[PDB]
Amino acid sequence: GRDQAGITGTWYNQLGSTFIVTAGADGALTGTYESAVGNAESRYVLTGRYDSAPATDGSGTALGWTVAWKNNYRNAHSATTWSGQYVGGAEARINTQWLLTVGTTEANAWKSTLVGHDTFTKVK
Amino acid sequence: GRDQAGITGTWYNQLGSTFIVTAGADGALTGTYESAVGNAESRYVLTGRYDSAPATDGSGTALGWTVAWKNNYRNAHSATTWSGQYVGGAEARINTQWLLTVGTTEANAWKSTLVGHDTFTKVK
Amino acid sequence: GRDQAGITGTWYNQLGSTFIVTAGADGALTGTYESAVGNAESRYVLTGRYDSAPATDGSGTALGWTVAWKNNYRNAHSATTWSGQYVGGAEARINTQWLLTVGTTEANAWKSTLVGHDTFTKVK
Amino acid sequence: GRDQAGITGTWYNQLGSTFIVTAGADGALTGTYESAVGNAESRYVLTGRYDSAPATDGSGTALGWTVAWKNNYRNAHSATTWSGQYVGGAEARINTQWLLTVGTTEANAWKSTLVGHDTFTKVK
């Protein structure tokens, strides 16, 4: 991975959530997510993928990951996926949009999925 | 996983894409995605997570997964995440929404991310 | 409008909701929305815009509209916007994605917005 | 409208786009949008709706609006809808998510719709 080192480490969103991730040379993302907002608590497992050979034209590095909101302490019966890109440099960022789906009855399916955005930085 | 067997197997979306996945008892999703539409070709690795202890109130099972669109044949410098829920039964379904992010320059970041929806079935 | 007549009329989504709209030659959409699902009841006012000079290359006609979920009978303190395109022909369709935002406290803002999709047809 | 005066006026997003709007007492939004980014130029008409009787529990005021990207100078054959809420006070904000749909062939429909977010302020 060109940005395997850039991505690997700890990231913080604008809400104080904490995203610890290892980027493998094959394109794997693996780590933990600790949410600061919502119906979550400790750490949760995360897995995802990233482009391990990004364009060198100054473009960002596409990636995404999933957290299922079940751990030893909570089950929210829901999952969030983040889709975004890593932008390296002095103020490195991971810019994302996310989809959070809650398990629902078929009658409530139309309102199963929230959408939002998170900006992750290396500081805070 | 309660629906570890329900989820594990091959799924087909309304476009003919093919989603082969193994659901682990710990909540891991792992498999391959073969797209029928877009700037993709063979199989791509996928990883994700699911709720391995869904509510038994008839609600669906939340899950999501990521594909980075890089394999031995293509690099689209992009990643898609699907967020949705598995609904078991005679006409089992995985109902999803997805976010596709393309690596972009900062000037083009505002248009980096497509949104869509996929319905997966066990047939077709 | 090239599809001013194509768009103008009554549309039904996969849920049984009813969308009655007039497309003006200037690009205005105006009408009423009657929801079949959710925390809504009678008709609600809708307004929006459409491309009154679509490409003739077989492409669809971009449009969108908003409903605020307040009428004489209900106030859900929320608004939905549909973004999509009209596809003419024997099986004419309006294919959309929508965002539903609920008024929230700042603490709950991160979960203010649902995302979904609706397909509208001239029949049902 | 409780926030008819709060909403009415000029708003600027983080990109420098300019959103001039009048909120009617019936819940109408009408105005112009002048984009600073993308394939747009001068002003474009906008119309939308807002909740003219928001909850007084400190919650925001739900609203949305549509711009079709056609004016006397440009036709992008596309439309954007913003869905969000107005938050009053010393640092008043309109927090939104948006969907931009481009008219496409049926073969390209799956990639017709971009998603993003805009934060509007009274300054800048």
Curated annotation (Swiss-Prot), chains A, B, C, D:
A motif (Cell attachment site) lies at residues 49-51. The keyword Kinase does not apply. The keyword Amino-acid biosynthesis does not apply. It comes from the Bacteria. GO terms for cellular component: extracellular region. Biotin binds at residues 33, 44, 82, 98, 110. Keywords: Biotin, Secreted, Signal. It is found in: Secreted. Residues 5-124 form the Avidin-like domain. GO terms for molecular function: biotin binding. Homotetramer. Belongs to the avidin/streptavidin family. The biological function of streptavidin is not known. Forms a strong non-covalent specific complex with biotin (one molecule of biotin per subunit of streptavidin). This is Streptavidin. It comes from Streptomyces avidinii.
